[PDB]
Amino acid sequence: LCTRDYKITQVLFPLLYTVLFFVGLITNGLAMRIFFQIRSKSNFIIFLKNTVISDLLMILTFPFKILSDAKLLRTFVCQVTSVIFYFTMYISISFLGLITIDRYQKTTRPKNLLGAKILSVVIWAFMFLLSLPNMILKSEFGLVWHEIVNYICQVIFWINFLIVIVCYTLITKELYRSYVRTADLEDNWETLNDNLKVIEKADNAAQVKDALTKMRAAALDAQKATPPKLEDFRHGFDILVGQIDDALKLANEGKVKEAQAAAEQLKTTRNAYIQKYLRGVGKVPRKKVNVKVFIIIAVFFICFVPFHFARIPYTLSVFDCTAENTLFYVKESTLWLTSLNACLNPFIYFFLCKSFRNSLISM
Ligand SMILES: CCCCOC(=O)N1CCN(C(=O)[C@H](CP(=O)(O)O)NC(=O)c2cc(N3CC[C@H](OC)C3)nc(-c3ccccc3)n2)CC1
Ligand SMILES: CC(C)CCC[C@@H](C)[C@H]1CC[C@H]2[C@@H]3CC=C4C[C@@H](O)CC[C@]4(C)[C@H]3CC[C@]12C
């Protein structure tokens, strides 16, 4: 009824999948060799470990899709392996949500290794006995069971998608907050030093009065942003603000030359000592690695987001062959992106697991 370019149907796609199959077998190959030469000492390494599996279960369905699509009984093994694939994909999606959570929790931190394995087994089993009826199969109980599983699967995606949205939203708000705090504090000090130069090269009392005002404000801002350390990180600020206040008085009284020299006293060795110490106390770096953590949301968005997003228009809202062909391609390519996950998961192991990257540095 409807015809498409076999250059794309029987060639491009089978090759695209062939790429994925190899690229995916090698990376997940040496991955599994690394992962069972690492003791499972946390939630994370454990969820990662399950990912290696569901990835190899994914790769091992590619050939049957490759040979079928390139036109090489022959049709029932297609229904089974595709079930195994769909099983595989929603497992990947489930663990990715857990990995998200697990990673999000370690970014709100300066009983497990046993419940983690159990939750894993729940994941698999609940997918398996949801994948069983589809490959168990006239009897029209099953083609309404398709609307059952298809429904479950939408919920599985959307819940884990929400998880991802929330966790990365909380991680983004925190990393932003952390950035602005440090950016401002650096600003504070930079203003202090900048308005001293202004003072140094100033004529009137108005120039001195203004720069000192900015300095006073910046200093007090710095002090606010720098609570004392639990171990003279409060008395120091009193000295610096003191000098600034003194210089301000001199500048208000009219004596600009004295003002400038009172200002200059921040350049004494002791005052600069104090400054360097107060600058020191201020910087306390402890933020989650940027392009390292976001890899997950990335992989999730590349692989799983499109297949589900693209469905909602033309699942919730035609005879012509271009529209039915547009749909074929959209579905088929999004499903390719889905499969790409088995190749993008090794990246998560690399960019986020210390021990993994070590074996990978070696073997
Ligand atoms: C726990 C795991 C258990 C194992 O899982 C399974 O066994 N699953 C059964 C198959 N299932 C699907 O998700 C099926 C795949 P298939 O149809 O069987 O190949 N997709 C659809 O049923 C479907 C329908 C649809 N429409 C409904 C009419 C409308 O006509 C206008 C089109 N559109 C799209 C769509 C997709 C991507 C992009 C654009 C559109 N998909 C996944 C879960
Ligand atoms: C389908 C409708 C009713 C919305 C339901 C969404 C549920 C399933 C999602 C949305 C936001 C999610 C939460 C987002 C963040 C956290 C904090 C983390 O420390 C543990 C998981 C937890 C608590 C998630 C659990 C699942 C959650 C509550």
mmCIF file of C-alpha atoms and ligand atoms in Angstrom, residues 101 104-105 159 162-163 166-167 170, ligand 2:
data_model
loop_
_atom_site.group_PDB
_atom_site.id
_atom_site.type_symbol
_atom_site.label_atom_id
_atom_site.label_comp_id
_atom_site.label_asym_id
_atom_site.label_seq_id
_atom_site.Cartn_x
_atom_site.Cartn_y
_atom_site.Cartn_z
ATOM 1 C CA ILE A 101 18.627 9.633 42.249
ATOM 2 C CA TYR A 104 21.652 13.458 43.088
ATOM 3 C CA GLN A 105 21.949 12.207 46.685
ATOM 4 C CA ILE A 159 7.913 8.774 36.050
ATOM 5 C CA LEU A 162 10.089 13.315 36.122
ATOM 6 C CA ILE A 163 12.765 11.890 38.423
ATOM 7 C CA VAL A 166 13.487 17.009 39.357
ATOM 8 C CA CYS A 167 16.927 15.716 40.343
ATOM 9 C CA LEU A 170 17.671 20.491 42.227
HETATM 10 C C1 LIG B 2 2.089 10.669 38.175
HETATM 11 C C2 LIG B 2 1.908 11.924 39.019
HETATM 12 C C3 LIG B 2 0.864 11.703 40.106
HETATM 13 C C4 LIG B 2 3.243 12.442 39.591
HETATM 14 C C5 LIG B 2 4.078 11.454 40.387
HETATM 15 C C6 LIG B 2 5.571 11.617 40.174
HETATM 16 C C7 LIG B 2 6.473 10.793 41.110
HETATM 17 C C8 LIG B 2 6.401 9.309 40.758
HETATM 18 C C9 LIG B 2 7.917 11.334 41.114
HETATM 19 C C10 LIG B 2 7.992 12.834 40.710
HETATM 20 C C11 LIG B 2 9.142 13.470 41.512
HETATM 21 C C12 LIG B 2 9.878 12.275 42.110
HETATM 22 C C13 LIG B 2 10.865 12.509 43.247
HETATM 23 C C14 LIG B 2 11.938 13.517 42.852
HETATM 24 C C15 LIG B 2 13.052 13.569 43.848
HETATM 25 C C16 LIG B 2 13.237 12.685 44.818
HETATM 26 C C17 LIG B 2 14.296 12.922 45.876
HETATM 27 C C18 LIG B 2 15.225 11.738 46.082
HETATM 28 O O1 LIG B 2 15.984 11.971 47.276
HETATM 29 C C19 LIG B 2 14.454 10.444 46.219
HETATM 30 C C20 LIG B 2 13.436 10.233 45.093
HETATM 31 C C21 LIG B 2 12.425 11.395 44.946
HETATM 32 C C22 LIG B 2 11.563 11.490 46.221
HETATM 33 C C23 LIG B 2 11.541 11.188 43.675
HETATM 34 C C24 LIG B 2 10.546 10.014 43.798
HETATM 35 C C25 LIG B 2 9.506 9.918 42.670
HETATM 36 C C26 LIG B 2 8.773 11.242 42.416
HETATM 37 C C27 LIG B 2 7.908 11.628 43.632
#
